[PDB]
Amino acid sequence: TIKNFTFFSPNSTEFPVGSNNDGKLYMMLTGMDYRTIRRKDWSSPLNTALNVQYTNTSIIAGGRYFELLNETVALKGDSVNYIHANIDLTQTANPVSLSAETANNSNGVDINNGSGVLKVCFDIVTTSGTGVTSTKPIVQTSTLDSISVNDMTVSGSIDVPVQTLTVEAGNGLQLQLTKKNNDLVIVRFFGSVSNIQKGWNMSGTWVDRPFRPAAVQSLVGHFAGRDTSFHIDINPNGSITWWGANIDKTPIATRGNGSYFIK
Amino acid sequence: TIKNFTFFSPNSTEFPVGSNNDGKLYMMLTGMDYRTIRRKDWSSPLNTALNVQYTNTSIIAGGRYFELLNETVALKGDSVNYIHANIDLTQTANPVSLSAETANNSNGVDINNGSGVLKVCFDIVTTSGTGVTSTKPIVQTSTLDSISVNDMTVSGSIDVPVQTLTVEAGNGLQLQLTKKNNDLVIVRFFGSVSNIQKGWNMSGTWVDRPFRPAAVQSLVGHFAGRDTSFHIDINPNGSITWWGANIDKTPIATRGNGSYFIK
Amino acid sequence: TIKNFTFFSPNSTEFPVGSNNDGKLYMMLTGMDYRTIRRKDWSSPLNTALNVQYTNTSIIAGGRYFELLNETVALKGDSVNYIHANIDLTQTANPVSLSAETANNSNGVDINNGSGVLKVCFDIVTTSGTGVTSTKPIVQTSTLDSISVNDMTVSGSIDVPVQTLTVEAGNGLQLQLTKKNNDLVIVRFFGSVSNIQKGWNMSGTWVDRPFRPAAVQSLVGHFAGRDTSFHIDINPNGSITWWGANIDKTPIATRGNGSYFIK
Amino acid sequence: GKVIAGMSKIYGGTAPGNYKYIKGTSYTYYGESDIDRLSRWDIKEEIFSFMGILYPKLPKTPAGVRFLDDIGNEYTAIVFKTEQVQDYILINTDVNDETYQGWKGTTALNLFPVMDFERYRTRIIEKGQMELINLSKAEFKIKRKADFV
């Protein structure tokens, strides 16, 4: 069966939309689950000793909207309290209730589809023997699939996928690659190269396919304790071609950092 | 004229809200066009022979919310089935229907402003001759103008703007610059340098304004097949200053990657 | 006191949801304040002489949805007109009114919780003596707390937290560090190094804790006007270890750029 | 549909308007703004031939009818791309005497070579709806077969 909602009813009975139906709709619009919330303080909550009064705070928990108008929450002495929003649909008169708990007891119970009481933390209150010391609000998670955007501003940080690789190029050369967001790679030179000529391909292991660049990348390194330098050409096929001066049987320590774009 | 919706009707008749008005409102709140969906499987769909039963799935298509409650879609064997939600507003009693198609036939029809049937693919179900082998959902796209965020986690990749520039710097030196996010630049050295002195400006083209740094950037390079190196300064005015040793008539091949920030 | 809204009313009197209650609800879903809008041109607005007609444009200002259907607004000759959406709840017959103004007079009045007239610019119309020259719409800022995304495509730029530090390494070395997103750091070499041996530590200042990498990063530099190079080891404890040629009393200018990852 | 207090989505009664979520009666949308845009040419039983008088809007834009199946996809389409605005296109799907003529004034023009041969897949119209491409008005006469009567 297909239950239609955002559609007009000519006989005014065809498509009625309920609290749970709209609740599920709102959750999809903002991209939230039963473990996260949408919270906004229109006026800062007052702190009177071991009590916290929410002057005007609107909360969307499990797609269900409710306003806290001068609602005081009792706090535990010298403890880190966790303020939870409790939604019990069986209580037709008062479904939403608040509680200050010892630990974060967010259950993530599906109330719009199934039965149960939904518990979700929104504010963390750190208290002393006398009163409130500090307050920290729970992060509002916005789970999304793909974003098309013009501009962005980040105040904290971005977590891009990281990939590590350690290819033994040969002749005594070791490379430490670190690829982030499948584009920028920083190659770290290690070991001691011996028995190699200019323009000659390196004996050992070749660069793996996820780390191979689109074009030949010329990366500069340095010989430790000297004023002499070298460079290696990482061709698109993964082959590492030496381009420094001809090195004999004696091995010289190779160190350095080189950045390149794959894309 | 101005048509108001989210406003009080003093005589209960002034501002009635239509399903098309709410459809547009919802599309705007979530940042969706007619070529995407919002979809949530509250319970897992069940595969039985060449059929997919949507047990409890909510979908938003063209800002219209509907629920699939024990709704079975018959599938083609040994095929890739594209599951579509089809919205025909003229079919007053049953505006929504599901189809399993041979291709992604999403049409992007504006059902909230005009006539026509909206078709939007939301699932890809692959079959064998006997049943379902795999299911892949269609991506839910969020089209946004400007984001102010605290923290973000990316599981796939971020695509940022890329600009490229080749500079014939002079004296045989070539620079291939790649700029990403309008900030990070990686310079790749090419060509062969001759007839230049330390502290002298290269005799060719200056760096184009979009690639010019805010402060002077010293980029280290290497002479192919040698133990020797050089550096060049990309000045904020776009000029390039040679900072290697003096070079005679014989050209020496110049290579290497150097990075800088514009901002 | 708790005011519940997205809930069932048993006696059909329990939870009545108002225009301001839904208004606040819609704002929190999209992540907007009283200073930004949600605007979409379904059909491109027509410009006839010193007037702009909005054929079909829907706007969500202060969480209040309204449609502009062939609504024409008069403009000022040879001026930059700032088109505002004016909401006055006291004007019960017509709450929304449009106005072309001299400057961006956006007030950000909380109409949902308190009283007053809300003003918010959405379009910037640049005109001539005869008609319209160019039109630039106001940005739609989506303020969010945390994002859990898979993929992203940016058409402009992403602003990441930038931190700068100038370390006087010692022996005549200066390091200009530029940290972006608390991960990628590009170090610039400055000054003239004198009296130092290979494998020996730096006499001056150590690298600060936020700029310290996870592992020892070998950063390559170059001596200005010469064909000789050097490399420094920035250890995780903040210590800088020289790894170039031994330098005598005469100071040689040190320049170059070296990039590394912290995480 | 008509607007009813408590049943429809409106913010009415005592200020600042109130709409209640009830069980079954709740909120049902009244209708749609500009519901005059929605028009369905309904096909309920399989039809064989037809005599349509098509009134085209824009010249040089493919003008003619297309047919939609039950899932909103196209199977057949009689579409013509004319140089000037015909006053009316006369189309007959009868097998024996097919007519595809564009009338302008008192002059009759043969529209067979201008027609899209790839889009016109079948003559037999199936259950679904008909869509008018670049047409201001349409007048149709449908003939449908019955084996025994």
Domain C-terminal end among A138, A153, A169 = A138
Q: Is B10 on the interface with C (CB under 8 A)?
A: yes
Rounded to an integer, what distance in angstroms lies between the CA atom of residue B227 and that of residue B229? 7
Mutation target for A interface from C5, C7, C160: give the one with most A CBs within 10 A: C7
Rounded to an integer, what distance in angstroms lies between the CA atom of residue B130 and that of residue B50? 6
Total number of domains constituting chain B? 2
Q: Is D16 on the interface with C (CB under 8 A)?
A: yes
Domain C-terminal end among C138, C170, C185 = C138
How many helices and strands (H and E) does chain D possess? Answer: 0, 11
Q: Where are the beta strands (DSSP E) in chain B?
A: 2-4, 38-43, 46-47, 51-61, 64-74, 80-87, 96-101, 118-127, 132-137, 141-154, 158-159, 162-170, 173-180, 184-193, 217-223, 229-234, 240-242, 252-261
Q: Is A253 on the interface with B (CB under 8 A)?
A: no
Q: Which of residues 81-110 of C touch D (CB under 8 A)?
A: 89
Cβ-based contacts of B258 with chain C (< 8 Å): 257
- Are residues A245 and A199 part of one domain? yes
Mutation target for C interface from D7, D11, D33: give the one with most C CBs within 10 A: D11
Rounded to an integer, what distance in angstroms lies between the CA atom of residue B172 and that of residue B189? 11
Assess if residue B103 is contained within a domain. Answer: yes
Q: What is the DSSP letter of D39?
A: -
D129: left (phi over 0), alpha (psi -120 to 50) or beta: beta
- Taking an 8 Å cut-off on Cβ atoms, the answer to whether D33 and B97 are in contact is no
Contact of C119 with C84, CB cutoff 8 Å: yes
Domain C-terminal end among C77, C107, C138 = C138
**What value does the CA radius of gyration of chain B take, rounded to a whole number of Å?**
30
- Are residues B120 and B84 part of one domain? yes
* Phi and psi torsions of B25, nearest 5°: -55, -50
Rounded to an integer, what distance in angstroms lies between the CA atom of residue B38 and that of residue A28? 6
Contact of A81 with A100, CB cutoff 8 Å: yes
- Are residues B207 and B132 part of one domain? no
Q: In what order do the strands lie in the sheet with B162-170?
A: B162-170, B173-180, B184-193, B252-261, B217-223, B229-234, B240-242
Burial of C1 by CB count in 10 Å (0-12 exposed, 13-18 middle, 19+ buried)?
exposed
- Are residues B170 and B63 part of one domain? no
- Are residues B166 and B128 part of one domain? no
Q: Which of residues 11-30 of C touch D (CB under 8 A)?
A: 12-20, 22
- Are residues B132 and B168 part of one domain? no
- Are residues A31 and A125 part of one domain? yes
Helix (H/G/I), strand (E/B), else coil: B105: coil
Cβ-based contacts of C245 with chain A (< 8 Å): 225-227
The four Cα atoms C206, C211, C216, C219 give a dihedral, to 10 degrees, of: -90
- Are residues C181 and C126 part of one domain? no
Assess if residue C210 is contained within a domain. Answer: yes
Type of residue found at B70: N
- Are residues B204 and B107 part of one domain? no
Beta-carbon contacts of B158 under 8 Å, excluding residues fewer than 6 positions away, are: A158, A160, A181, C151, C152, C154, C158
Assess if residue C13 is contained within a domain. Answer: no
Assess if residue C254 is contained within a domain. Answer: yes
Assess if residue A153 is contained within a domain. Answer: no
Record the tokens describing residue C27, joined without a space: 């704002």
CA distance between the termini of chain A: 47
Record the tokens describing residue A217, joined without a space: 């990348």
Q: Which of residues 25-44 of B touch C (CB under 8 A)?
A: 25, 27-31
Determination method here?
X-ray
- Taking an 8 Å cut-off on Cβ atoms, the answer to whether B154 and A159 are in contact is yes
Q: What is the DSSP letter of C210?
A: G
Q: Which domain holds residue B63?
A: 18-138
User: How many CB pairs below 8 Å do chains A and C form together?
Assistant: 200
Give how far B219 is from chain C: nearest CA, Å. Answer: 5
Give how far A40 is from chain D: nearest CA, Å. Answer: 21
- Burial per residue of D131-149, b for 16 or more beta-carbon CB atoms within 10 angstroms, e otherwise: bbbbbeebeeeeeeeeeee
C150: left (phi over 0), alpha (psi -120 to 50) or beta: alpha
Nearest CA in chain B to C184: B184
User: How many CB pairs below 8 Å do chains A and D form together?
Assistant: 37
Closest-CA residue to B259 (of B188, B169, B181): B188
The number of C-alpha atoms within 13 Å of B89 and in the hemisphere containing its C-beta is 26
- Taking an 8 Å cut-off on Cβ atoms, the answer to whether A9 and D29 are in contact is yes
- Are residues C173 and C130 part of one domain? no
The four Cα atoms B67, B73, B79, B81 give a dihedral, to 10 degrees, of: -30
Assess if residue A13 is contained within a domain. Answer: no
Domain of C131, CATH number, reads: 2.60.520.10
Assess if residue A175 is contained within a domain. Answer: yes
- Are residues A189 and A126 part of one domain? no
Beta-carbon contacts of A221 under 8 Å, excluding residues fewer than 6 positions away, are: A189, A229, A230, A231, A232, A254, A255, A256, A258, C220
Give how far A77 is from chain C: nearest CA, Å. Answer: 24
CATH classification (class only), D1-149: mainly beta
Domain of B202, CATH number, reads: 2.60.40.1830
Instruction: Point out which residues pair with C125 in neighbouring strands.
Output: C81, C135
- Are residues A190 and A110 part of one domain? no
